[PDB]
Each structure stands twice: as structure tokens, then as C-alpha cells.
């Protein structure tokens, strides 16, 4: 409910106050999705002006990952304490979206960490926020993800949703057709076998009858 509270608080604010509200939104805990804030006209109006840095920061927090704050570090404003942790959590979510068994090396590289203890503590505190759910295997150095939240989307990604839902629908339809075909074939086999058995019995009975001569 936090994001709609901030949006209502930002109905008319613009300029410096809007940038301050953007920073407070990025720092506020529990807000891991910023898509309704981005749809606001005044928020998108920051491109024309000297505040395009905050719009870039919001875009990075909505669709980007932590390594992207490795090449735009100079242009972007300074990042706070909790903001970096939130970006790292969103990077973990982005990694878990693709693969369900994230190796430790990948997390260490993209999250820019040096120790295993620090990485495991970050993953544990990300789990405690209920953005991802999973278990840590240390003998094999894997993070096994059972559930993760859906991050923000652009207008050019919905086509992918349609593409991957069409495959599922077609697979279900093809499974149903195969099931019906198997049922039909089995019924035909049973009927043919009992017709053949009854015909053999009828032939034997006829032979027995004509044998009485």
C-alpha cells in the first residue's frame, strides 16, 4: 500500500519536491516495484530539464540491475545505504527470474561481493523480505529458488507473455487430443477382441452342433 500512498502524496508536487519524493520512494522498505509512479505525467516530464538523472535512477530501479550501476555510476546521483541493498535485492530477483539454480559465482560477480558470508547474509535478508523464497546449498554452492516476485515490465515485453502463454495453451490442447485418441483406440481394441472371441465361440458351437450327425 506504500506506493499508492506516495503517489497520492505526489498528486501535484513537482521540481525539487518530486525528486525528494522519488528518493524517499527508492529508500522506503517494502516497495520493490515502481511502475505506477513511472506512469505519472509529471514524473516522465523530468526528461526535459536538469533532473533527468532522477528519471534515469527510477528507470534503473524499475528495470535495471546492479551491474548497470557500474557504467552509469558517474552520471547517476550518489546512492544511499538502503538504496544499494534494494538494488542488490532486485538484482537477485532478476537473476532468479531466468534460472532456478543460481550459482554462487554469478551472484558474487554481479552483486560485487568478496566474501561468502556477506553474500549469504544478503540472500538471507532478501528472503526475509519475502521477495524470493529458496534454499542455500553450500556443498554445491547453489541457491535453489522456489518462488520469486515479478518485477516491472515495459510495453515491449507483453508480446513475450503472449508468446509463452500460446505455447502452454497449445500444449494443453495437444495433450487433450492425445488423451481422447488413446481412449478411442483402447475402446476399439477391447471391442474387437471380444467380437473375435465371441465369433470363435460361435464357430465352435456350430461345429459341435453339426457334429451330431
Amino acid at each position: 500500500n506504500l506506493l499508492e500512498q506516495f503517489i497520492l502524496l505526489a498528486k501535484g508536487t513537482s521540481g525539487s519536491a518530486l525528486t525528494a519524493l522519488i528518493s524517499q520512494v527508492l529508500e522506503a522498505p517494502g516497495v520493490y516495484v515502481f511502475g505506477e509512479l513511472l506512469e505519472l505525467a509529471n514524473v516522465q516530464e523530468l526528461a526535459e530539464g536538469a533532473n533527468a538523472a532522477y528519471l534515469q535512477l527510477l528507470n534503473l530501479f524499475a528495470y535495471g540491475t546492479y551491474p548497470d550501476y557500474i557504467a552509469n555510476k558517474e552520471s547517476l546521483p550518489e546512492l544511499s545505504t538502503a538504496q544499494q541493498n534494494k538494488l542488490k535485492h532486485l538484482t537477485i530477483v532478476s537473476l532468479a527470474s531466468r534460472m532456478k539454480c543460481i550459482p554462487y559465482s554469478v551472484l558474487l560477480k554481479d552483486l560485487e561481493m568478496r566474501n561468502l558470508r556477506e553474500l549469504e547474509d544478503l540472500i538471507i535478508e532478501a528472503v526475509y523480505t519475502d521477495i524470493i523464497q529458496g534454499k542455500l546449498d553450500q556443498r554445491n554452492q547453489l541457491l535453489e529458488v522456489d518462488f520469486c516476485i515479478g518485477r516491472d515490465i515495459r510495453k515491449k515485453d507483453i508480446n513475450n507473455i503472449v508468446k509463452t502463454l500460446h505455447e502452454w495453451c497449445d500444449g494443453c490442447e495437444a495433450v487433450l487430443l492425445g488423451i481422447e485418441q488413446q481412449v478411442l483406440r483402447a475402446n476399439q481394441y477391447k471391442e474387437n477382441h471380444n467380437r473375435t472371441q465371441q465369433q470363435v465361440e460361435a464357430e465352435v458351437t456350430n461345429i459341435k452342433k453339426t457334429l451330431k450327425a
Binding site: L116, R117, V127, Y128, K135, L136, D137, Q138, R139, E144
Partner: protein, 116 residues
């Protein structure tokens, strides 16, 4: 409730306090939330809770071994069993803030009887 002995009886009281909201403005809510939900209590939170405690509540049977300090360790070890599939001694000790030999001993004690 937090200082009480382990069991289901204390668990019911923990759930009752958690359902209350007036408890959100208390200084010990940050530890009740982790105690009821089976989370890991770090060192600093326990230090703050002990600092805010009263001297008579800080029982310390036998050689120090403060009872609260042992219960928090046994709760952290139990809570780490849901996040990890298998944990090394050198990093189970660094997670509970104890030497590795102590971590192995506590894990064996809890695994033996019935607690893990």
C-alpha cells in the same frame, strides 16, 4: 514471554502478542517478530534486549551460560535449518557468533534428542 521457557505454551502467548498491534510501539517488538516467525537474531539485537532488561530477569545458571544467551543460540540454529541445505562448521559458528567447536557441539546436542 520472551524470557519464558521453550514450549508450545509460550508459543501461544507469542502468537497472541504478535496479533496485538499495541505491541508495535514497544522496543522489544523487533525481537518478538523474529522469535515468533523463526528468524535469526543477530548479536546487536540481543545486546540491546539484554541492556534494556532488569537485573533480576537476567538469570545465569552455573558458569554464566546465560539462559537467554543459550536459548537465542538454540533458536538461531533451529531457524537456520530452514534456509540452509547443509552448512559448514566454520560458517555455522560465524552465523551464531560462536567458535566452530561450540557450533558442532550444539548441533549434535540438538540433533540427538529430538530438536532437529
Amino acid at each position: 514471554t520472551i524470557l519464558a521457557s521453550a514450549g508450545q505454551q509460550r508459543s501461544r502467548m507469542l502468537a497472541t502478542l504478535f496479533k496485538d498491534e499495541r505491541c508495535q510501539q514497544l522496543a522489544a517488538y523487533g525481537i518478538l517478530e523474529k522469535m515468533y516467525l523463526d528468524r535469526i537474531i543477530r548479536g546487536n539485537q540481543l545486546q540491546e534486549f539484554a541492556a534494556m532488561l532488569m537485573p533480576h530477569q537476567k538469570a545465569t545458571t552455573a558458569d554464566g551460560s546465560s539462559i537467554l544467551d543459550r536459548a537465542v543460540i538454540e533458536h538461531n540454529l533451529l531457524s537456520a535449518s530452514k534456509l540452509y541445505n547443509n552448512i559448514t562448521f566454520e560458517e555455522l559458528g560465524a552465523l551464531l557468533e560462536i567458535p566452530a567447536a561450540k557450533a558442532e557441539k550444539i548441533a549434535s546436542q540438538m540433533i540427538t534428542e529430538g530438536r532437529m
